[PDB]
Amino acid sequence: SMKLCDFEVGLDQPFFLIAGTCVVESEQMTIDTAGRLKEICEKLNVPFIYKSSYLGMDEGLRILSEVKRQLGLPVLTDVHSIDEIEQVASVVDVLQTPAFLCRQTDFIHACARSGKPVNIKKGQFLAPHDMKNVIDKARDAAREAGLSEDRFMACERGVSFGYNNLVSDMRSLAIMRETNAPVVFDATHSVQLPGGQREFVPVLARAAVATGVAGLFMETHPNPAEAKSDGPNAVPLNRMGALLETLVTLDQAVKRNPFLENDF
Amino acid sequence: SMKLCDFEVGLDQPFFLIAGTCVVESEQMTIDTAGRLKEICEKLNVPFIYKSSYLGMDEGLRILSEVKRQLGLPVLTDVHSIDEIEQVASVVDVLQTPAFLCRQTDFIHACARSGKPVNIKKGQFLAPHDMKNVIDKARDAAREAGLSEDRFMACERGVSFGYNNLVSDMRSLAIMRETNAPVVFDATHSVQLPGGQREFVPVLARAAVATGVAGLFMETHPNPAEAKSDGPNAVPLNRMGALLETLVTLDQAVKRNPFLENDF
Amino acid sequence: SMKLCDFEVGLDQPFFLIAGTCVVESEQMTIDTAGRLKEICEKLNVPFIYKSSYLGMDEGLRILSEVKRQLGLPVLTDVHSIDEIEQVASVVDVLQTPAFLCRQTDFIHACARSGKPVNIKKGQFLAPHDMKNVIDKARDAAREAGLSEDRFMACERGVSFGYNNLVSDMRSLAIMRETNAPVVFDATHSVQLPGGQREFVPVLARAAVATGVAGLFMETHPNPAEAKSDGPNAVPLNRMGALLETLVTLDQAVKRNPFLENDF
Amino acid sequence: SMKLCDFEVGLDQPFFLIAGTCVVESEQMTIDTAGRLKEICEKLNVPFIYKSSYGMDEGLRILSEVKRQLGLPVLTDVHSIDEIEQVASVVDVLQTPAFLCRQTDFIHACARSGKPVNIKKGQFLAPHDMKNVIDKARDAAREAGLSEDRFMACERGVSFGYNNLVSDMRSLAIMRETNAPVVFDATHSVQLPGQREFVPVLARAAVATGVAGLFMETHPNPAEAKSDGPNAVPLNRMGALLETLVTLDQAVKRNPFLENDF
Ligand SMILES: [Cl-]
Ligand SMILES: [Cl-]
Ligand SMILES: [Cl-]
Ligand SMILES: [Cl-]
After folding, report:
1. 3-class DSSP state for residue D3?
2. Do the beta carbons of residue A135 and residue A173 sit within 8 Å?
């Protein structure tokens, strides 16, 4: 298990949820959604990290400070450039790197040296085995900076499948265990057609948790039709409870005994 | 729900298992493997159909007739040409079509009119939505012979992914529900590299069962290292009970409540 | 495990259900109730035996024969005297002994050599440790007839608690494991006040399944208000699904691991 | 729900655990056991209250140290009207001996103590009788300026012939009519007025029945325990059992209790 915010995560722990609205829409929208997700995850005993991407950076980050302060929740956001990292790491608990930047070594190194843990998204162009090199390079930067190495996660978000389609290869979730980092599944982005697919979010979420992951990322919204960003792939907030209850059941079923593939 | 052999199958029923050795190796290998699967499946309440491929056709079919006569088990085998349909159908309980022949309508029609149910394999070159037409055509032929139309299953066995690789798109398992036929997942052939992938058989089996299917196919062998065909991808017989017990748990979890994707 | 009808029962197996209307009311009431229970238990994967007590003996058994004929279900009925055994055993799949006859050794003996398995009810006057002697005697008789000994269940139905009251001692369910026979819990009669307690049927069913049993016996009816016998303690047929769903979850939870009492 | 210590309890909430060594044996025995129980319960999200019985001065001192050092709420039994003031000044929850459930001067005094009270049902009472006991405790509280929602009804067995108790699961449902959280005492419900094998059995049954709380005695080495060793659950098995109980608790509270439709 690696230490993440106030809990332990890993293939050998209960899965954690990263969830929130796609973009920081307003302050009430973010605080209300964060609070509702807290209550949902509290009842299910699912460790929960709130996400939104950044109204302006400053105001987005301020609102993220308020979720942290008001609700006591850890928060995660994406960083897009080396110059954003110092400011973002001073506010949030976990950085996340864009999938397209997974091979930009200066940028990955900079996140690695930030002093915060990093959820490293796997590019749509990588093979699952390539993620070992990504994580290893991040760990060299961390070690160079005097920081611990157990602070990265490998995040699956789909691989290119012809034009304008992604496929979620469940083998990837098993392969990336070789990174010795927690594996996270991004269920919302894995259904997106590049360049609504909501119906497939529960499908891939069930499939992934059953495969065996450390964490799950999902976007949500109270009324997704009225969402400011990527609405058609968000799970409505009033259905998150039922979905998570099913995923907890799958997670317990597959972790209660060793994974058969390990005996192969 | 569809009647298959002496049980009810479908998305709302507990999953059924199709399993056996890849090919008929020997009468004793087959009877022993079949018998030991029967005891594993009886203990878990998993409906079970024995499968092996046809030592020559006459001899392979004789031996399958013995699995039937000695053990009271339903049996399934794949049929390779129109010429063999009549003989094979007089011995087995369920026909299965090779994936490459899924668009050969004369062949599909002949299987459909055979008098036996047919597990129709989705070609590695088809899109999931294409399988509706294949099933609709099979049902035409059934109907024209006076036969019930609910005697077909849609079988996922992987889709081409670059060269020498297949990917198991879990969205396919949901999409093919539109065929109004039971969807069956072939976990063994889904991991094969076309043109040593055993470790992914349980991974995809767990993923597919969590996604929601009517049926599961897997090859097994008492000692896969000595198998006469596809040995590297066979699950060992002495690990089948453990695997099946996990799959039952998953199957129940996802079918206890409606699938969330149906709200979408 | 013990082999029962077409399945395997026991303390380590998923629980089975014995259920039906208290008495055979009519052919249509029996067939419809049997058919509804069949479909509910099929979906939940609960092995199922239909029961009703005998319109006259001849007509009662005829109708139970129709349940087998028309629905292919196994059927259980109670027998009341030695002279009725040959006829009843010629029709039904499982005999049941009335609780008050549990010490009538000639009658218990005749049932035990009938050629059919027997659910032996524990008299309201017996202590749980006394059932071992009953089962041991039944097994003597079976063995002497050249029959298998593993063909009996011990069925808990309450113990006398003062006047006009029965209590369900959950310790009995554990103690009677020493019979080396599957233990069955009669939820419907355990709530009866000798000489409407329906509300306690779910209570005691949940307690018993959580305690750990091989089987459950419950009386049901489409509309208990119009039931010809024991109507006020029957579970309505339209609530059986919901109840059984809860009970399967409890059964799995307690049988996933060893029972802690086996360490002590 | 009712507020109890820093959490909410009730038939509609996750079950809480009351547990500890039968008696206060030692400061280190008490602090170590309370610490391991805290860790086990934290891991499972089981709200936890530490119990041991008390001489009295030294017993309450050691119980104050469990609170100070581990931040846990503590419960103990009080035996007489004249112990109440001191006990309530130290502990978070009082508990009344079963035999005293109809001794109303005593029950009233506990009710006016300022603390919540787990009221044990006498082995001689019928389940319907606890309503009267709770109503009278609530009157005493109200007549003294205190909130009425501070009592729990605790099942610990009913007399069954001579030298035996039986745990009537109907009692746990019936006592919901008190509109107070129902607590099951799994340890004393097996005691013959050497029965540890029935503690898991009754705990599982009671949780599946549906209760607000569970009480169990434990010890690191029951063989070497100073009272009731033969009925203690060994500490190194409490995790396993509680894990089972949590699943049962969740499963029965996930939907409405079917008995509420009949
Ligand atoms: Cl697609
Ligand atoms: Cl690969
Ligand atoms: Cl009563
Ligand atoms: Cl006893």
Report:
1. strand
2. no
What the block records as the tokens of C171 is 């310790």
* Type and span of the H or E element at D154: strand D151-155
Chains D and B touch (3+ CB pairs under 8 A): no
Q: Could you tell me the two tokens for A132?
A: 């070992």
- Cβ–Cβ below 8 Å for B14 and C245: no
- CB-count exposure of residue B159 (10 Å: 0-12, 13-18, 19+): buried
Q: How far apart are CA D212 and CA A153, in angstroms?
A: 39
Count of other CB atoms within 10 angstroms of residue D49: 25
φ/ψ of B235, rounded to 5, equals: -75, 135
CA distance C48 to C71: 12
D84 φ/ψ angles, rounded to the nearest 5 degrees: -60, -50
**Phi, psi for residue D117 in degrees, rounded to 5:** -130, 125
HSE, CB side, 13 Å, CA atoms: give it for residue B178: 13
The answer to whether B152 and B120 have CB atoms below 8 angstroms apart is yes
Helix (H) or strand (E) holding A51: strand A48-51
What single-letter amino acid sits at A236?
P
**Domains annotated on chain D, with CATH:** 1-262 (3.20.20.70)
B2 CB-near residues (< 8 Å, 6+ apart): B8, B9, B10, B150, B151, B153, B181, B182, B214
What is the crossing angle of helices D56-70 and D27-44, to 10°? Answer: 40
What gap in Å lies between CA D114 and CA B243, rounded to an integer? 56
Minimal CA–CA distance to A64: which of A87, A41, A83? A87
Ligand 4 center–CA D252 separation, angstroms: 28
Expressed in Å, this structure's resolution amounts to 1.9
- Tell me how many degrees the CA angle D177-D180-D183 measures, rounded to the nearest 5: 105
Q: Does residue A91 belong to the interface with chain B, where contact is any CB pair within 8 Å?
A: no
A27 burial level (CB within 10 Å; 0-12, 13-18, 19+) = middle
Angstrom CA distances, B142 to B99, B111, C197, stand at 20, 9, 54
B119 contacts: CB under 8 Å, gap ≥ 6:
B18, B76, B94, B95, B96, B97, B153, B155, B184
- How far from the centroid of its chain's Cα atoms is residue C211's Cα? 17
Taking residue C3's Cβ as centre, other Cβ atoms within 10 Å add up to: 14
Biggest CA–CA distance in chain C, Å, is: 51
Contact present, D196 and D167 (Cβ < 8 Å): no
DSSP assigned state of D115:
S
d(CA D108, nearest CA chain C) in Å: 32
> How many CB atoms neighbour CB C11 within 10 A?
18
Q: How far apart (Å, rounded) are the C-alpha atoms in residues C89 and C86?
A: 5
Nearest to D60 by CA among D38, D82, D77: D77
Rounded CA-CA distance C101/B146 in Å is 56
Helix (H) or strand (E) holding A26: none
Q: Is C5 on the interface with B (CB under 8 A)?
A: no
Dihedral of the CA atoms D230, D236, D242, D243 (nearest 10)? -140
Share in percent of chain C as helix, strand, coil (round to 5): 45, 20, 35
Q: Which amino acid is at C100?
A: F
Q: Which ligand is nearest to the CA of C174?
A: 4
Farthest CA pair distance, chain B: 51
Asked if residues B263 and A239 have their Cβ atoms less than 8 Å apart, the reply is yes
**CA D164 to ligand 4 centroid distance, Å:** 7
Query: What is the distance between the alpha carbons of residues A135 and A177, in angstroms, rounded to a whole number?
Result: 11
Are the beta carbons of A242 and B254 separated by less than 8 Å? no
Beta carbons of A242 and B260 less than 8 Å apart? yes
CA C129 from centroid of its chain's CA atoms? 19
Among all chains, which residue has been given the structure tokens 């031996």? B63
Q: Output the six-digit token pair for B251.
A: 């199957």
Single out the residue of A169, A262, A216, A123 nearest to residue B207, CA to CA.
A169
